[PDB]
């Protein structure tokens, strides 16, 4: 798995992440990971982990660096011999993160950084939870998620830059614009 790309997806809440994600696998054919969706499944799963991470997700909160790369690592591996890239999104979230992920998988090669204003973000995650209903919607919980996006997982943006492989992406625009973008970042791998 360390011999695939390895790119990461970095951004707010309803910065629209998993949508320019889902994009990418259709037109590259990239694995799309998501920690949310891998952390959601273990809640639908039953277990008593489930009811544990179900708690700390609809509080907004973080759910614990092992936990979270475990389910990553475990999926990278499912899915191994399949795929020539991988789309790490909604992970890291913190810089403890970004360097665990690289002492136990390999370092990644593009940060695609979704950068979106906090209004849009909130505007976005009001709407989906009229929608779709995810407990984690609710107003209260929206401005925890995104009080500590901004803490927490935009260091992990300076840190990449560090690095320097954060491309950022102006998320504002209409989706088909972003995507372009989006495009442009990856073909000039
Ligand atoms: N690494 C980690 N470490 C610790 N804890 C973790 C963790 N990962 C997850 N967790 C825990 O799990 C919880 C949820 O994590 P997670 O599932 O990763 O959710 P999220 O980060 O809050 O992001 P969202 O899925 O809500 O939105 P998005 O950024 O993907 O945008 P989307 O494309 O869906 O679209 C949003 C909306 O806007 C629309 N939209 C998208 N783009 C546009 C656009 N250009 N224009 C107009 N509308 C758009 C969309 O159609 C959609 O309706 C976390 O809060 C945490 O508790």
Same mark, same amino acid.
Do not use: W
């Given at each position: 798995?360390?011999?695939?790309?390895?790119?990461?997806?970095? &951004?707010?809440?309803?910065? &629209?992440?998993? $949508?320019?994600?889902?994009?990418?696998?259709? /037109?590259?054919?990239?694995?799309? @990971? =998501? =920690?949310?969706?891998?952390?959601?499944?273990?809640?639908?799963?039953?277990?008593?982990?489930?009811? #544990?991470? #179900?708690?700390?997700? #609809?509080? &907004?909160?973080?759910?614990?660096? %092992? $936990?979270? @790369?475990?389910?990553? /690592?475990?999926?990278?591996? !499912?899915?191994?011999?399949?795929? /020539?890239?991988?789309?790490?999104?909604?992970?890291?979230?913190?810089?403890?993160?970004?360097?665990?992920?690289?002492? +136990?998988?390999?370092?990644?090669?593009? @940060?695609?950084?979704?950068?979106?204003?906090?209004?849009?973000?909130? +505007?976005?995650?009001? /709407?989906?939870?009229?929608? =779709? &209903?995810?407990?984690?919607?609710?107003?209260?919980?929206? +401005?925890?998620?995104? %009080?500590?996006?901004?803490?927490?997982?935009?260091?992990?943006?300076?840190?990449?830059?560090?690095?320097?492989?954060?491309? +950022?992406?102006?998320?504002?625009?209409?989706?088909?614009?972003?995507?372009? #973008?989006? =495009? $442009?970042?990856?073909? !000039?791998?």
């Amino acid at each position: 798995i360390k011999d695939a790309k390895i790119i990461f997806v970095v &951004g707010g809440p309803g910065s &629209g992440k998993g $949508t320019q994600c889902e994009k990418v696998v259709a /037109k590259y054919g990239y694995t799309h @990971l =998501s =920690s949310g969706d891998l952390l959601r499944a273990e809640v639908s799963s039953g277990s008593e982990r489930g009811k #544990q991470l #179900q708690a700390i997700m #609809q509080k &907004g909160e973080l759910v614990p660096l %092992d $936990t979270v @790369l475990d389910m990553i /690592k475990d999926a990278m591996i !499912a899915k191994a011999d399949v795929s /020539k890239g991988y789309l790490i999104d909604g992970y890291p979230r913190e810089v403890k993160q970004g360097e665990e992920f690289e002492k +136990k998988i390999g370092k990644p090669c593009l @940060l695609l950084y979704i950068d979106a204003k906090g209004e849009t973000m909130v +505007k976005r995650l009001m /709407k989906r939870g009229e929608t =779709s &209903g995810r407990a984690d919607d609710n107003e209260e919980t929206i +401005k925890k998620r995104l %009080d500590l996006y901004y803490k927490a997982t935009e260091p992990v943006i300076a840190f990449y830059e560090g690095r320097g492989i954060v491309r +950022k992406i102006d998320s504002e625009l209409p989706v088909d614009e972003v995507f372009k #973008q989006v =495009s $442009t970042a990856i073909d !000039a791998l």
